[model samples]
Target: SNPFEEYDGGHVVLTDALGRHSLWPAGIAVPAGWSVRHGTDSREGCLAHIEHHWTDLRPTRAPAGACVHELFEAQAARAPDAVALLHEADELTYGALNERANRLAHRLVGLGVAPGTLVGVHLERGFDMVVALLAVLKAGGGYTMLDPQFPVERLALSLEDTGAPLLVTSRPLSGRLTGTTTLYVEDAGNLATGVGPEDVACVMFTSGSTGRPKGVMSPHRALTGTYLGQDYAGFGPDEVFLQCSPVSWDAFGLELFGALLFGARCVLQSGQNPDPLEIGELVARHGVTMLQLSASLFNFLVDEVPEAFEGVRYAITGGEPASVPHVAKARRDHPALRLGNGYGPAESMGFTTHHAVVAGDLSGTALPIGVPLAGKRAYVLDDDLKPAANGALGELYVAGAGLAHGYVSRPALTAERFVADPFAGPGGERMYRTGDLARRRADGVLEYVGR
Candidate 1:
């Protein structure tokens, strides 16, 4: 007799490390680290038990008070000699990377790069790019990345909008990034300093539907808020993370800073567009355990090089709706691997919601975007700005510590998207109107319908 049929429609409730509850078919063995919290002969009873026990939406752990750079500094202090970064034929220890960043940071400070000042970063992808970013944050200045692949006109437009006083670039790109005060990386001296948590950490540009790209200014707290008390994937010194996304992409935060902040070694790809074979080799070479990829790229890897993920313990996919078939196949092939379907906008740092894909999560036609992360909240609101009932479709609004400050130099656009949060208390916190449609299921899972 089939083991699943023995349940006779019964369900088992299981809980994960983050206290997230899910229903599994009776008689099936639960995933590792998960306990059979409750058992019910009826599916409804199992769901009811989950709904009752998972009442508190807030994370159990408190948020970290330090800024992102501060977190990195603490890790470096704890383990100075540990390998922190890995590139082709080059490796940087935690102490070495920190020292290099300190040198450049002192140079930036000499160039008047202080708190709230935007520093232009025009460089080819390499170990130096990572150092430059950290240097900016350490110097109490925010960085605006200018990819060499971008047209000179676009780069110039970005430079004009930010009005960055200093541009950090190599000697080769000095001629192209002219008209700005350039600081070559080769001329850096050692110095160390710190910035407040509320200081602007970086300025990321988004190509709007119309006109020029809009720049988003994110504070140090916003970046640090995303990782504090994070439980979606086990991030620690024992893990190796692959950093493959372009610097301009928001996912870069999870790929680079996310790893460094936790004392994990970050493996950098040689180029922006790495083929599946190269990514597979990198994974094996570095023993990468945690990876974040767009849904499309994840699906491509599932089809092209499934073995690449053989060593990956946690694979988080976002940026678009995940393919149900691909997710199902991945889970079926790699039963030990934990697959997460994440959702969020660039305006909300990295991710707001993460759904751990269980055995039957993708059984339906659609997959749930999962629950909000720690220190974040998600609401589906109707046109009247009222909370929509469960199963009712409405626009998604996100509010919490991870929200970005606002668009840089575009007050009108900022006003239109970042609105007053009616749900917040007397202090009047703000929420970002995602413009994406979502609906909450009775079980508290958010389903992405469309844009």
Candidate 2:
């Protein structure tokens, strides 16, 4: 009854739908739906064969090439009566939301906002903020979020860098954000259309190691490519998503647009900082099924209110290394829940890799950052810019459609980090060389080592 007992027969290579491969004894029954791609008596030969055949690490599903606004409009057309956005006492149906955004788009167009234009969105987290974002996109213009909480100097720097034509804000806070052409949200107008997939979508600024913040400019493709074909969670009309992240962060894009793009209802948290108790109540009351939290906040929730995730099917944690102990405990307490570890910076438009946590995955000292999403590629390369062998640590480089256009007005820094992507063809695609170090495990999962 020794499990180590190997059949004296040949070995076979088994391949699954997810492109996972393994060597198994030929004499044993193959896994239920997996096919025998190759067979050999030697285990080494079978493994070598598996490696050659699984060279392409891309996801089976192709990334969708469409604009976020297009996807939302399609959903709105299909289910105009469905609730698209929700706050404590306010709710906006898809029809109402689209109409409001259309009105705002007309106003922005009147202010001369067009494709490639970056408009400043200075609004609190609520229904108005959501409408403003869609309005910017609808007007064929991208938005640069200016969180009201940001220091006035920092806000001034962002506005100066973007060179925005006009700022979108409420009348109450117009004085603080002075010296910019401002538009009040309450104004009304007609619909403005003709925006497409190739238009600039947004500009997100990340705090730099140095004093200045680096702006990452993304197009509509980056947003659509990341979320439209996303398989990390069941994102459909039935899912209720909780929007709790700060609007300035890239995660907020996933929270807000990820839901609307797929016809799901997005419940907007009332304030900048969320209380775990209130979050738990929100989940219970609204039947929120999906949530994405920063690693630290997720750990805090696991400790304070484990029951907050009672009905949640998928709870994703990222923005920092996920806590193994907290993830393990949460999985133990809620057997029905599926925890995920996501890794990416603003340059990749929120997420490039995601690992679904299982019980055995936590048994190890560390968890892998997981595989690349559709239309994305992760590489571990040595200092010489060549690929590193499995288990050999090196700098991690991310390439693919999720990549941002480049830093706004920082040509030197952009050229330094966003180098020519050799893997991509002669046409000149680029990959972001993430300063962080990582390694690929023998099983093909990537492990984040350090910076």
Candidate 3:
């Protein structure tokens, strides 16, 4: 009944196996085997949409090597002459750092350190701390970070949690942790002299919702992936990454590894309270390219010195969502700067999801935590354990090679969080169910909702 229904426009053509024909109008199409379904005006039933079939999706390759210390070996092979670490005025070339790490590793082995052997690392941030970490891994042992700032009681509790046989620290802190075999850094220096790939690197403690801290042991392969992801993110030998976080938190993982693993220069910013303006000046004076900030700290920097971030190329931020106004201000101020919003807990090796800030949404908007990097997955599912429908809210689950094996000696707690993947058939795989809620958008991007 409509004149336009059968009208043929020469500009548009439909080519089929039989012949070429004009495209038909929507209502006029009466194909032999096709049926049309439309929503009724009554609106009685809710329409549920299926977003992902995943038939074409394939598994991602997981990186080999368990601990992060193995990065020293890999870098030594690739660029031994490259700068492996930088702390203030001190710098160690990859070859020099590797040699020191090997020496420390040998020392650890002589001290009776072996695979699963727990060692305590309690010391100030310096070259010795770095070497001790590498040495522990080389000797097939895991070390727990004991912040010298922690009260003696907390330190004692952490040491006991790991049941470490040897405590590695400077002479001063060595006297503080009692009832543990004290191995002063200087004394251990003579023994740790070699390292290999298959070794246990470190056991990092993270405070859960309940009492006592949980220890997460890392192997060489896990550390390698962490290094590789940073490498893929453009952290390189030529860059300067300001050590903005303490070694206790997961952010420290990024600060430390981002520098040593990639052979970048690391300028440690110490003191109890850090000054944003001072951090800005460090970036300018040191030609720092890659930097990270918490959402709160980032807001302060943008509000205080909008022009201070002139030479910075990448700014990775997390810890909280960036409001819309905050997002807009950052984009307006740093037009040339690439803003990356990273989201992940310590268990995922610092960060798992990342979203780049473009135009608008500055006041710290809750940006989507984007897709997985290298070997990671973002799963959205309902209570029924089925993949959530597009636009429907569900808890975010993470699976892939990046997952830590499990919490050390916390089988019940580990089982509580890490469950067998329902999506993967029996014994197929396991996933960590993050309590936060998310939704799969129409474009297949996973969007973050409030937890």
Candidate 4:
């Protein structure tokens, strides 16, 4: 006989040819000779039973601190002597880096930078740029990154949009930003400094549909979100994460904060163009276990340095879909590595879903976005508010702790895009409608369709 025999279509009886009472949900089917019983014990006897083993899987919280600066402070406390940032040939311990950032922050504050002031950072990749980024947050000012590769005219337009009071740059490019009050990092390298966590860290710009660039304002708090998300992935001390993305891109947020938050080390790569062999050598030398890269850059590495990826334990790919060739090569080279195909836009902070590359064959046209991180939700909605059926394509809506503070100084545009989140908890919350399209799989994973 079944361990649980139903009766009265509502209850269950369990016994060894005799009978023990069990309660069940209403409207359940019953077999003949089964007796109906209502008792304190549930159908499973007030405890859950399972034939297979399961483990507790819960999301991890990011380290304490309202901003990335605080994250570094925490790391300094735990691992003061641990190397935090690595350049081509040098490194800075967490304690040393934090102090340098504070000193720079003090200088910015002395220059009359109040909270929320956007500071311009026009520089190349190196220790100075890294220090400048941290100092902006510590100084209660936000940084607007001006990539050297961008035309002076284009960069000037972005600076104007930010309305930054001062620009942080090196001695060489000082000529380009003529009218702005410039703080030369090289001159201020020896100064001492201090700042709080509520300061504005940086602002990144993305291309707008109107051919203009829109600046996205990020508070130190938002950087905390990335640290939290990375913590969920088990990043921690003793790990060396390779820094590959331009500081201007959102991918850089992951590599930068992921290291500082976890007391891990970041190996920075430079030069006009980075060779695949160089990246491989860096990874091998520094024991870089994790890395994040865009689809195009990853493709470049896979093509140029096929043998250079032997030691990488984890690879995160986003910004674009991973091609079959790239995925195949990744599997072939790093069989023990966990390849995560993440999906998220700049406005949504960093990543929302991460799909592991379990097999080499990506015969399907697209991949999955997997599930949402903690404190987040993924709603697949059609023109109406209803959920689309499995395999149906619809705009991917992201809601949760990861949403940004909206586009800087573009209230009208922000209102048009970030809609009131219908799927939020009791209090009114909002969700950003990612223009990227996706489909729900039969097994419940979200498959990437396209933008």
Clashing pairs in 4: 103-193
Every model's TM-score: 0.83, 0.84, 0.78, 0.79
Give the per-residue lDDT of model 1 (tens digit) for 93-160: 98888888888888788889877688989887778888898899888888888877777788888788
Q: Regarding TM-score, does 1 or 4 come out ahead?
A: 1
Worst 10 residues of 2 by lDDT: 55-64
CA lDDT of each prediction against the hidden true structure: 0.77, 0.78, 0.62, 0.66
Q: Which digits, one per residue and each the tens of the lDDT, describe model 3 over residues 1-451?
A: 1111222221111112212121222323323322223222111110111011111111112334435665656766678787666556677777777778777677777778877687888877777777777777767677787877667787787778667889888876657878887777763232332433334455676432335777765555555555575432567788777776656556776767777776676676654234588788778777878778887888888888765577888877677775556656777887888887787756666676777665533443466666666776778887645688899988887876556655665543453455445455323355676777888888776677867
Cα lDDT of model 2 by residue, 1-451, tens digit: 1101244776666555545454555765554546677775476676567556655322123434657887898899999999998899788999899889888888888889887788999888888898898899888889998877778789888888877888989877778788889998874333446666656799886532336877788889888888877799878999999988877768888888889998999999887765677788889888999889888889988998887899999999888787898899888888899889999978888889989887788887777799999989998887545679989988888988788776776543454455545465434455687888899989889998877
Clashing pairs in 2: none
lDDT of 4: 0.66
Where in model 2 is the C-alpha error above 4 Å?
1-64, 187-193, 207-210
Model 2 / residue 248 / CA error / Å: 0.9
lDDT of 4 by residue, 1-451 (tens): 1112322333222111122112232344332333344333343432231101111101102334555666677778788799999998898898888778777777888898766578999988778887887788776667887877677888888888778889999988879977888898863232222333434466687532336877766556656665675433548897788776766756677777888888899988885234467788888889888877677777887778755567777777777887766877777776787777788877767787677766733555555667776666788877554578888888787877666655655543443345455454444445676777888878778777876
Candidate 4 regions exceeding 4 Å error are 1-65, 187-200, 207-210, 229-234, 272-275, 360-363
Question: For candidate 2, what is the total of clashing residue pairs?
Answer: 0
lDDT of 4 at 425: 47
